[PDB]
Amino acid sequence: MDYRQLHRWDLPPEEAIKVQNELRKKIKLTPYEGEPEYVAGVDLSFPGKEEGLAVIVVLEYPSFKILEVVSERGEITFPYIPGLLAFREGPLFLKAWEKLRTKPDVVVFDGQGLAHPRKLGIASHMGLFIEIPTIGVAKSRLYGTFKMPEDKRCSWSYLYDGEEIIGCVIRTKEGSAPIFVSPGHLMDVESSKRLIKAFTLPGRRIPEPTRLAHIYTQRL
């Protein structure tokens, strides 16, 4: 399974920041229309001090049947720097990506995308490489400002950077904290909202793709 190596990974943090900027102009915040056939959930986890693990699961929509599950381990060499996290986890995910048999229609990551100091969260960065619509879903806020939406199923608020809408905050499950949805590449706020709603069972808290990938990560 293919991808486009837009740049090298072994960069100094200063250079990494410069790339992010270059890539952000390549981002296309474009409506996703209709429903995907296949969605992928991604879970990037770190068993060791410098050991990463990438698990990808490809569900079929609307059934959420698990068609495929791939995983790779890699050395995590790049230092942990908030806003530069993709340089740590990007490489390893790509190893897992290359092992996929089924081509996903939309990919959901555990992170953000547009909601990023430089509008290049994990979902955005990888969207550029894998060249398919992506979304970032986070169980906790990473970037941006919001008003807590009410404690009522499916309530929601916009997420902001200053005055610009950078994603949304959804109360997916009553009496639980909300999730944080930000578009990646070939994705806008509005479409990402709709899709993530479409990927969540009522009324669980976490979208199936990411719930399931975590479950598989756990299974290891």
From Swiss-Prot:
- Using the record, list the residue span of the signal peptide; answer none if the entry has no such feature: none
For the site Interaction with target DNA, which positions are given? Y80
UniProtKB keywords? Cytoplasm, DNA damage, DNA repair, Endonuclease, Hydrolase, Magnesium, Metal-binding, Nuclease
Q: What is the effect of changing D43A?
A: Complete loss of enzyme activity
Matching InterPro entries, A to Z? Answer: Endonuclease-V, Endonuclease_V-like
Q: Which residues bind Mg(2+) per the record? A: D43, D110
Keyword DNA repair part of the UniProt annotation: yes
Result, substituting H116A: Reduced affinity for DNA. No effect on cleavage of DNA containing inosine. Abolishes cleavage at apurinic sites
**Region (Interaction with target DNA): which ranges?**
139-141, 214-220
Read off the Pfam families from this record.
Endonuclease_5
Major localization listed first in the record, in broad terms: cytoplasm
Q: State the EC number(s).
A: 3.1.21.7
Q: Which GO terms describe its biological process?
A: DNA repair
> Where does it reside?
Cytoplasm
The effect annotated for K139A is:
No effect on DNA binding. No effect on cleavage of DNA containing inosine. Strongly reduced cleavage at apurinic sites
The catalytic activity, as recorded, is: Endonucleolytic cleavage at apurinic or apyrimidinic sites to products with a 5'-phosphate
Q: Name one GO cellular component term.
A: cytoplasm
Outcome of R88A? Answer: Reduced affinity for DNA. No effect on cleavage of DNA containing inosine. Abolishes cleavage at apurinic sites
Cofactor needs: Mg(2+)
Task: Spell out the protein name for this chain.
Answer: Endonuclease V
Q: Which organism is it from?
A: Thermotoga maritima (strain ATCC 43589 / DSM 3109 / JCM 10099 / NBRC 100826 / MSB8)
For this protein's source organism, the top of the classification is:
Bacteria, Thermotogati, Thermotogota, Thermotogae, Thermotogales
